[PDB]
Every structure is written in C-alpha cells, then in structure tokens.
Symmetry: D2
C-alpha cells in the first residue's frame, strides 16, 4: 500500500513472532517502525539493518507493558524518536501461563489481565492524542490495530480461560472506542489469529499439533507471515478508510466469523 | 419450576434491582436464597420475612466482592448457613463510574475490573467444589448463572468502555468453564439484560431514557421482574438440563442475539 | 407456566420428534394444540387422547407446507377449529436430502428452500393477523417461535449446505419481523437445537454419533424432551414478556451462543 | 497486490456501483476482468478501454442470474473468453423491491430469493471446477468472494426482510463451502457493505440519509471505491492465503463485527 511510506508505526510485541513478521512487512512498505519487547532480543540491530535495507526505518524500545508507567514511557520514547504516531499496533500479550479455574489465584489473574488488557487499554490511551494529531494534520485517518484471538470468540483452551476472555474484552472495548473516538480521526480494527506457528504454541508436541490441524479446514497452523498483510491493510487509509470496529480472523477456516 | 423447591441459591448483588426481583421469585419457588450486597438494605429483614411467607427461606450476607478473600468468605458463610450450594448467580456488578478513555487511570481501571470480573471469577472458583458436590449427590446438574449485558455485545456506553468489555469478558469466560467443567456436573449460562429500570439507570433524565427507548422495538425499559424468570429457567435442571454455555438477552428487541 | 392454560398453539411439524415432545408439554400446561405433519402418524388418535387426558386439547392437520396455499389452508383450518391463534411454532422442516454443492440442482434447491424457508415465511404471514388480534384482545403479547439449528450458526454438514443456510435465514428474518411487528403485539424467538435424538439423525451409525458427541461437552445427543421447556418459556408472556428477537441454542455446550 | 497480475476475475453485477468500482481496481492490478450485468450498460466499451489503458483486460457478459441456465452460460462464456477462472466475485443482487411481511406473495418471494441466493449458489457451483483446476495448476489458492450486507447481521430494513435474510443465508452457506471445498484449493470470503452511495440507496431522500448517518460513527455513507480494496485483499493469495470463511464489514462503524 503506497500510502504507508513514511508512516510512523509503533508495534508492541514485535521482538518476535507475529509482531516481528508484521514489522518487517511495514518496513518494506517504507514505514518507520517501533520495535518492542520486554528485553532487547539478540541481534536486534541486525533486524534494524534488514528493515532499513528494505527502505524503511526501525528503532527498538524495551518495556514491560503490564504497568501503565511502562506504556506511557514507550509512547513517549517512540514519539521522541520519530516525532509522532500514525499507527498503533497492540500486539503484545500472551498466555502468561496455564491454570485451571480452581487454580486461579490473584497473582496469576493479575499477571494475565495486566499483560493482555491493561497493556492495550493504557498504551492506546497514551497514543490517542498523537494519533488524533497526525489525523488532523493529514486530513486522513490514523489507525489502531489490536491483536485478538480465535479464543476471543469460542473461549480459551485448558488453563487459558483468562487469556481467551481477555481477548474477548479487547474485541469489545474497541467497539466503545469506535463509538466515541471515530470523531478523533482514528479507526480501530482487530486481527484475530487462529493457531499460528510461533513461540506461543512451541510447547505443543506434533501429536497435539496434528489434532488441532484436523479441526482446521486448511489442515495446518498459520505462519507469522500470513498474519502480517492484514495489519498493513487495516493501517492503510487508502485500503480501509471506511472500515472501523471490525475483527478479522486469520485461521485457515478454523472459526468462521 | 417444581425442582427448585429446597434448592440452595446464592445470588450476589441481590440487595436490590434485578438480583432482588430474582431472589423474590426463587423464594416463591421454595428455594433457600442467599441475599447479598455491599451494605444491608434499610429493610432487609422485611424482605427476608416476605420471602419466608412466600414459601422459601433467605439470609443476608454483606461483602465487597472486589477482593478474592471477600468472595471466599461469602461462599463459606453461605455454605455454613444452608449446608451447600446448588445454584450460584453472579449478579453483583456495576459501572462504578463513567470515565472516557483519556481519563481511565489505574485506580479506576482496577475498580471496574475488580467489581465486574475478579468478583465473578473468584466467587465461581470458590463455589465450584460445592456446586460439583451437590451435582454428584443428586445425579442432576448444578447451575452457575451470570448477569451479562447488551453492552457485552455492542460495547459500553459513554465512559463505560471497561464495563461493557468486562461483560464481554464474562460472556467469553463461561465458554471455557463449560468446556472443562461440564464434567463436574455444572451448567453455565448468562442472562443479559438490555436497558432495565433499576438504580443502574437512575441518573438518566427523561429525554435520555426516551432516546434509548426509540432504539427498543418494545418502546420501553424493561423491569427487574421481567429479568427474573430466565434465571429460574437456567437454574432448573428440568427446564434447561441440556442447555449450557448460552447467553440469553432480555431487552425488548434492542439487540437481537 | 400458568398463563398457557387455554392458549391456542399451532405447532407445525408436531407429528413426531421435537414438535411432538413440545406439543405434549403444551397440553400438560392446558393448551389447545394444533398437531401437524405431512402425514397422520399411525397412532395420532392415541396421541390426541393422551394430550386430552393431560388437561389440554389437540387436533391434527395434514399439510405439506412447501406451498403457500397449504400454509394458508393450515392456518384457516386451525382458526376454524380453535377460534384463533395465540402461539405459532414454526417447527416443520428438515434436510430433504444430502447433496454436495456440485450436485445441487434447481429441483433439489427448490425442495430444501421451500420446505425450510417458504414454509416459515408464509405460515407466519398468514398467522400474523390472528396473532395480532389475540394480542389486542388480551393486552398481552402473542408469540411466534421458530426452530433454528446449530447449523444456522456454524454451517450445514455434508450435503446439508442449503439446510444450514436456510436455518441462518430464519435466524435473520426474525430480526426484521421484530423490528416491524413488535407494534402488532407479537414476540418472535427461536429455539436452536444442536444434535437431538430424533428421526432427523436416524441415519447416523453409532460411530458417527459418538464422534459428534466428542465435540459436545455434555458428551451426548439431546432428547426431544430437553427441547420442549424452552418453547413453553418463549410462549409464556409471564416468563418472557420482554424477550424478543433472540435465538436460544440447546446443545449441551456444542456451540456457545 | 503483485500476484493479481494476469488473474482471471469474474465479477457478477459489475455493470455499475460496487461491482464496477471493484472491477476498475482489479484492472489497475493487471487482472483480466469479466464485467457483468442483466443488460450491457451504455458506454460499456469505454469502460473496457479505461480498464485496458490501466494495464488490465475486460469483456462484458449479459446474464440474468435468477436462473441456473444463465449462471452456467455466464461461466461458460467467461471461460471461453479468458481460458479459466482464478477469482469469482458474487456481487450481483439487490432488494428487488420492498414488501412488508403481510404483502409477501410467491412471485416477490421467488424474485428476491432467486436474485440473491440462487444466483450465488449456482454461479459458485458452475465456477467451482474451474477455480479448483486453476488452484491445482498454480499450487496456490483460487478465491470466491461474495457480497454480503450489514442486513445479514442485524436484519433487513422496511420491506426488506427477505433481502437481509438472503444475505444471512450467504454468510452461512460459505461456512459449509469452506468446510468441504477448502480441499479443492478454493478460499471463500465475504465483503459486507453497510450503507453505500450507489443506485441501491438512490431512492433515499436527504432527510433519510441524514438520520442513517447519525447511527454511523463516521457520519456518512460509504463510497463504492471504499469497498473495492477489500475484494482485492481477499482475492490475493499473498495477502490472505490463510484467510477463509470470514465476513468483513465495511460500514464506518455502523455495525461492529
Ligand atoms: N500464536 C497464535 O496462535 C496466536 C493466536 C491468537 C492470538 N495471538 C496473539 O498474538 C500476539 C503475538 O503473539 P505471538 O504468537 O507472536 O507469540 P510471541 O512470539 O510469544 O510474541 C509475543 C510478543 O509479545 C511480547 N510481550 C509479551 N508479554 C509482554 C509484556 N508483558 N510486555 C511487553 N511485551 C510483552 C513479547 O515480548 P518478549 O520477546 O519480551 O517476550 C513478544 O514480542 C499476542 O497478543 C498473542 O496473544 C497468537
Ligand atoms: N439495569 C440494567 O439496565 C442492566 C443492564 C445490563 C446489565 N446489568 C447488570 O445487572 C446486574 C444488577 O444490577 P442492577 O441493574 O440490578 O443495578 P443495582 O440496583 O445497582 O444492583 C447491583 C447489585 O450489585 C451489588 N454490587 C455492586 N458492586 C458490588 C461489589 N463491588 N461487591 C459486591 N456487590 C456489589 C450492589 O450492592 P450495593 O447496592 O450494596 O452496592 C447491588 O446489590 C449488574 O451486574 C449490572 O451490571 C444491568
Ligand atoms: N434433530 C436435530 O438434531 C435437529 C437439530 C437442529 C434443528 N432441527 C430442526 O428441528 C425441527 C424438527 O425436526 P426433528 O428433529 O423433530 O425431526 P423430525 O422427526 O423429522 O420432525 C420433522 C417434522 O417436520 C415435518 N415436516 C417436514 N417437512 C415438511 C413439509 N414439507 N411440510 C410440512 N411438514 C414437514 C415432519 O412431518 P412428516 O413426518 O409428516 O414428514 C415432522 O413432523 C426441524 O425444523 C429440524 O430442521 C433438528
Ligand atoms: N449499496 C449498499 O449500501 C449495499 C449494502 C449491502 C449490500 N449491498 C450489495 O452490494 C451488491 C452490489 O449492489 P450496489 O450497491 O453496487 O447496487 P447496484 O449499483 O444496483 O449494483 C447491483 C448490480 O447487480 C446486478 N444485478 C442485479 N440483479 C441481477 C440479476 N438478477 N442478475 C444479474 N445481475 C443482477 C446489477 O446489474 P444491472 O445493471 O443489469 O441492474 C448491478 O450490476 C448487491 O449484492 C447488494 O445486495 C449493497
């Protein structure tokens, strides 16, 4: 999408997996990309070099987004480096762990809820004034894209009740954000991955992987690369200017939304 | 519903509104009802007397369910009083306040999320072994019924982004609970009120109420009493023994689920 | 439900299965029931006698509802017999046959679409003035309840693409009916069975049945009797007076709606 | 998307409106486009010239898709012209007319159902062997994209009950098609317009247009041009290769799916 050249794109949880594949694609489109994780990954500067060689720009920011303080600092550091924000991608998140209902204590509850919900709510909040300002300047829309999940539709797997429901929370809160912040020139959409071959599912044996694939019409897990184009699509005003408040599931037909 | 006579029914947030109307109906059906709120209503003993006159029993327990410890204590007190639990109704909840996204800070976030999510997760967790034991003893199912919202479908109203999304969270977490606790003899279902004439909407002026009613095919707010039968329906093994993991919206056609 | 005594209840496809189980329950509640099928069951008079012994009344009408003329005639005959209509249950329907997409020709298409859609649309159309008149006379609501399907959510099974989509059609058309006929005093709701042990699934071998049951949290097919109480619930103004435009899935957790 | 160059794209109902805008964009991507309507529009050869000058190719085919014979002939003529099919877009359809439930006769019913359902089912059926053959040859996927509607979610408007439910039927039938034809190398997705400024809404007065816009967060109708990129996205194997069985609503936030 030609209108992504020069766009300032902050992608949380882009140190690996879906976020990283997505960041790579934005850089190829000429975007200025904020790479993010809890820790700087090894060879982060190689990644930055690849992204620059593809015609974009990149910088890494470390933050554990479970606290609002880290969310505000991430936004501030990103704006300090690139001068504003056109696109926020709330992709940071994960299972944290697996605990069945009888085992859910406050510590685990807090960990899952902070990683998956507080992170998105607060990072979006802090980014919002910047996204709105960029929209006003261009006369076109800025974009928030959050990563959902198949689990936000049908429920979390074993020990993952809080995770699935946290994703359902995101699917819903976007609806409120559309209703009252469309007037700020910001579109909100969600990419909802199914079962994707990343670190997220690395613990699964081939036997478990085969059983899941049996319930997927395409008969396989997705790749991180198969998630990325949807993010660019939702980020592009030319592509999706009249699209807001939607969830797009990418899952080989596993769940039909 | 003849199989409700003698059933031990804990109803959170039954000190007033929908929870109270529901409690009154369970008592008419001969159930032993746990009444609950943050504070005792000024005429709680008259409510209890009326429920007993109607052929049931009642006892009041005060607890702020925003903390796990309070949820555990409520369940323990209820079990000490009536000897077990057959039905848990997770009805405690509310807006807490109205704050737009820019004004959503940690303290407010925590308040809404604890009141609406942690309360349900923890009360259900602590009630579960009792519910499972009652099901095993009877060879029939126990029931968890949680109060959702139209907002859990379409998003929270102004300043209610977290509230709407918290209800979406409940709608989703029930799906995980069904998948892995159906084997424990417990059915999980949701009653999802639309716009209902309780203290929840007491702050709405006449013109605002009428604006909302314009989007309701039945042309009016619902009553607390119009919510109550669905709760008894989901609680009754005879009525709904093969029904679990469902959300039933009661809203005069305002949202069609 | 005490307000069902004397109610005039036309139940299409009540000669067997879910419709029959439902009819029996209405008669136990004291309703006057219109029994219906394409052919009289070999022991229809014994069914009628049992319904009368239970405190209700019943009369059988034969009609193939694939044509509008037959739908009009059924409604007229029912009205001639019982003097009006308080509740219409659109339960007649079925697969007709199983043909994969490449084998879906005009004749098969017409057969499935007429049996499952035209039947519902036209029977409801012809019943509507009577339902409206009954509501006007009582000052309470009349009820239309249509039988949907899990398939109307997730898609038809092998060779059943048109059937699943026909049920989706029903789920949707009710929404239009609510928007513009709530003012006529009629509530429209749907009972959506999952996998139920009737003639509908009589062609399924034991290994196919247990394979489906593996995807059902309750681990078994439902019974016709487990469907029936929901129909009475939706028919009862006292029970569901503020409920309209809803779909209630009865499926042991197989699909969570 | 670079992988759309040379692709053979049959777009039903592309003589005007959304279908036409979509066709124009495919031609700009270098695709070979089958333009279609009931009648050759005036200046159709100018349109073909514009599309060729943009680096694509085009030919027009006349067919009323209400009959299976016309659907087969359209597919045959398209394949005769371009040698195969890579992408089918089922965009032909419309209200036909507005008749409230009491006014729905067989002729009107048949008209709406044939135009909106039989057309899609039969055209897809006839295209399927070609789409499958093209997928086998390339080793990638072919695409079917059907035009849905906001009405397929929330119901048809005044006199449009059958139209809304016909769109709901399409949303559902695609699910069956995914389940059993993903193995044929074909992906099926839906673009679901909200309120778009085409001939579809040309009858609406300024007053009515303003009141509808009030329920749209973006505060305006969409344009045909705002629908087009989503079709290209769903047609591109590179963009959406792991996406199948999805509905994407394009409606300025009017309905949040
Ligand atoms: N994979 C799937 O099948 C699937 C399905 C549905 C949804 N998702 C969602 O997809 C998104 C990306 O996950 P993935 O599959 O790409 O797995 P991944 O490889 O583990 O990536 C997760 C990313 O989130 C970051 N992150 C996690 N917790 C964080 C925290 N508290 N603060 C800041 N950053 C944090 C991680 O940073 P570090 O490098 O510091 O750990 C990492 O960059 C997640 O939101 C996940 O919920 C994945
Ligand atoms: N009314 C509607 O239109 C509507 C619509 C959708 C959903 N709902 C839901 O329906 C449920 C009942 O509310 P209502 O409409 O009947 O309003 P209500 O009159 O305010 O009742 C709410 C009940 O929840 C209790 N509660 C609130 N916060 C609590 C806490 N932190 N800990 C323990 N108990 C708490 C209240 O006790 P106290 O009075 O002692 O604080 C009260 O008994 C709520 O979950 C609400 O979210 C209502
Ligand atoms: N069983 C399940 O798992 C399941 C699941 C989802 C939905 N459903 C729906 O449940 C409803 C009842 O079916 P069931 O399971 O009870 O199976 P059933 O025993 O085959 O009952 C179907 C009833 O519909 C009548 N019928 C069929 N075609 C008709 C026509 N063209 N005109 C008039 N009446 C017609 C049948 O009459 P005759 O016997 O005289 O032909 C019979 O009374 C159907 O709408 C079905 O689609 C069933
Ligand atoms: N506009 C909206 O707001 C909106 C919203 C939701 C869904 N849609 C859907 O969008 C699609 C395109 O409509 P539009 O808005 O672009 O309106 P449009 O300008 O009227 O386009 C409709 C197209 O469908 C063709 N068509 C209609 N009936 C046909 C038939 N029986 N056989 C063959 N072709 C037929 C028409 O051909 P002719 O030129 O021969 O008439 C025309 O090319 C339709 O499926 C409509 O249901 C539109």
């Amino acid at each position: 999408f030609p209108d992504l050249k020069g766009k300032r794109v902050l992608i949380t949880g882009s140190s690996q997996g879906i976020g990283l594949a997505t960041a790579r694609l934005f850089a190829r489109a000429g975007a200025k990309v904020g790479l993010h994780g809890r820790k700087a990954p090894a060879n982060i500067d190689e990644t930055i070099a690849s992204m620059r060689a593809d015609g974009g720009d990149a910088a890494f920011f470390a933050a554990d987004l479970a606290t609002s303080e880290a969310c505000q600092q991430l936004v501030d550091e990103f704006v300090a480096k690139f001068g504003g924000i056109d696109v926020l991608i709330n992709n940071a998140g994960g299972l944290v762990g697996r605990k069945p209902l009888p085992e859910i204590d406050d510590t685990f509850y807090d960990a899952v809820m902070d990683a998956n919900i507080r992170s998105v709510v607060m990072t979006t909040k802090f980014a919002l004034p910047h996204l709105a300002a960029a929209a006003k300047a261009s006369g076109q829309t800025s974009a928030v894209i959050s990563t959902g999940s198949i689990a936000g539709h049908t429920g979390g797997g074993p020990g993952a009740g809080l995770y699935g429901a946290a994703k359902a929370f995101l699917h819903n809160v976007h609806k409120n954000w559309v209703d009252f912040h469309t007037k700020d020139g910001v579109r909100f959409n969600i990419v909802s991955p199914g079962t994707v071959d990343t670190a997220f599912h690395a613990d699964k044996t081939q036997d478990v992987r085969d059983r899941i694939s049996n319930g997927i019409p395409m008969g396989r897990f997705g790749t991180a690369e198969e998630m990325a184009p949807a993010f660019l699509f939702f980020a592009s005003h030319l592509a999706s200017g009249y699209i807001t408040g939607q969830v797009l599931d990418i899952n080989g037909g596993q769940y039909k939304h």
